[PDB]
């Protein structure tokens, strides 16, 4: 195991500009059609969300570039990707990404999500491996390419999987998934959404009410994270790995004040940020 890989390429991380994205319900209150303001962490509008390239193809001949570096967790991360083929599986938030400190690990494994908090011993380039098992006659998904050993684990949550796809429309959908993670005072909160889309590449213009998925009573100290890819074995086709092509958008939260507008149904709509410009 621990088959290192990366090459070197990377060029300048393509930047972009999300217009108005990442407005999560900043509480568990049901509300009517009012106007609500809130000081919290948010992604400021018209920010410079970095556009990272995973497995990256180039017009010329095969060539796959690998570049999902570890990134700073700062105070919160807006994670989003399109990915019609489920090649993103989860994330490995932590402090040192070794033993002597704990680490959180979220894997998807599309029949059941499962989260552990062990003193893992991750490789320097973790990923899930997919192979064939020759008994059970079924392509299993052994995770031992991620970590060496997992001892002292102090948690284990199982649940219907997050990344539930649909498509079933031969295109025109592309199903943009978003996630926002924030970690305060010994908790860990995840917010999600699945949205149909029709734009070419980048972020659309509407509003997304990211409603919360879970909250995890952990207390772990987090300052650096990474993301998991599900590469499969190649076989009799002339290392033997590297499925598909993937990319995701990352951008960090900051403490700001917003003026959310509620529906009569109980859902948001347009969020106004005090801080953007003088008009706001």
């Amino acid at each position: 195991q621990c088959v290192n890989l990366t090459t070197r390429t990377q060029l300048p991380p393509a930047y972009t500009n999300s217009f108005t994205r990442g407005v999560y319900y900043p509480d568990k209150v049901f509300r009517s059609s009012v106007l609500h303001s809130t000081q919290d962490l948010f992604l400021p509008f018209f920010s410079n969300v970095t556009w990272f390239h995973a497995i990256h193809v180039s017009g010329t001949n095969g060539t796959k570039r690998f570049d999902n570096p570890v990134l700073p967790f700062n105070d919160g991360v807006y994670f989003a990707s399109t990915e019609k083929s489920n090649i993103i599986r989860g994330w490995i938030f932590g402090t040192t990404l070794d033993s002597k400190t704990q680490s959180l690990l979220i894997v998807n494994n599309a029949t059941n999500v499962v989260i552990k908090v062990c003193e893992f011993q991750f490789c320097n380039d973790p990923f899930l491996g997919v192979y064939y098992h020759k008994n059970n006659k079924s392509w299993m998904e052994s995770e031992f390419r991620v970590y060496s050993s997992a001892n002292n684990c102090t948690f284990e949550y199982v649940s219907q999987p997050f990344l539930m796809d649909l498509e079933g429309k031969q295109g025109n959908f592309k199903n943009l998934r978003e996630f926002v993670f924030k970690n305060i005072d010994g908790y860990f909160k995840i917010y999600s959404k699945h949205t149909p889309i029709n734009l070419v590449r980048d972020l659309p213009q509407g509003f997304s009410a990211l409603e919360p998925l879970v909250d995890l009573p952990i207390g772990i100290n987090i300052t650096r994270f990474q993301t998991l890819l599900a590469l499969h074995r190649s076989y009799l086709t002339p290392s033997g790995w590297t499925a598909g092509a993937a990319a995701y958008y990352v951008g960090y939260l900051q403490p700001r004040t917003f003026l959310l507008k509620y529906n009569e149904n109980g859902t948001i709509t347009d969020a106004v940020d005090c801080a953007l410009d003088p008009l706001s």
Partner: antibody, heavy 128, light 113 residues
């Protein structure tokens, strides 16, 4: 991309049993199908053992049936083959041949048969 | 069970010229789902047999592309073109259908001295 490791020589005495081992490396033992092939010296190649990607069972050469067994330690990535009641005409090099059980991606399934990588042989010898 | 054969049981070829090994059968080797299973093992003296053109007409990884498979059904043929050194050994033609496999009657080649 695969490497097979043999198990050294073994001189024996007629009537005993002998077990030959083969360590894979590069892939894992739970996605290859092992076949054992003798080389009676100065002669051709002879098949025994093997594995059917179908039915998962492990066929046994009629010539050596009720006389050989084959087991798999999937933890240390070695396969074992136990020939018993060795007659005088079993001095041979014993090859550990393998392939990959299927072919392709998680989308396309071809149960693939044959031998692809051949692992360097051990040399048993019966002698009274 | 199958039980094919060979053709030249030798054929000390010349330098720089092509060569032809001819396999044969005693069944129809078209396995169900229609893909027949041949392979053309090359064994040096004192070494394990490596592999060459498996599955009728293909090529294995690292085979230096002088080798060519042909045939169908019951006749088969390997053909090297413009041979040189480092191609001297025995060329078995294993089948891979009907469980109890079986190998070719063997066929050695060498230099045409």
């Amino acid at each position: 991309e695969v490497q097979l490791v043999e198990s050294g020589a073994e001189v024996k005495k007629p009537g005993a049993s002998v077990k030959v081992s083969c360590k894979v490396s590069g892939y894992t033992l739970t996605e290859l199908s092992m076949h054992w092939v003798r080389q009676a010296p100065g002669k051709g190649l002879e098949w025994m053992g093997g594995f059917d990607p179908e039915d998962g069972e492990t066929m046994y050469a009629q010539k050596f049936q009720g006389r050989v067994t084959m087991t798999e330690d999937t933890s240390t990535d070695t396969a074992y083959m136990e020939l018993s009641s060795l007659r005088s005409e079993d001095t041979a090099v014993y090859y550990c041949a393998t392939s990959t059980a299927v072919a392709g991606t998680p989308d396309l399934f071809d149960y693939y048969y044959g031998m692809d990588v051949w692992g360097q042989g051990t040399t048993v010898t019966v002698s009274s | 069970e199958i039980v094919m054969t060979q053709s030249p049981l030798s054929s000390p070829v010349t330098l720089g010229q092509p060569a032809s090994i001819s396999c044969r059968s005693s069944q129809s080797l078209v396995h169900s789902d229609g893909n027949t299973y041949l392979s053309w093992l090359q064994q040096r003296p004192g070494q394990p047999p490596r592999l060459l053109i498996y599955k009728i007409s293909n090529r294995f990884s690292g085979v230096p592309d002088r080798f060519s498979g042909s045939g169908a059904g019951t006749d088969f043929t390997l053909k090297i073109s413009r041979v040189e050194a480092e191609d001297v050994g025995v060329y078995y033609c294993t089948q891979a259908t009907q469980f109890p496999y079986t190998f070719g009657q063997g066929t050695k080649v060498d230099i045409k001295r």
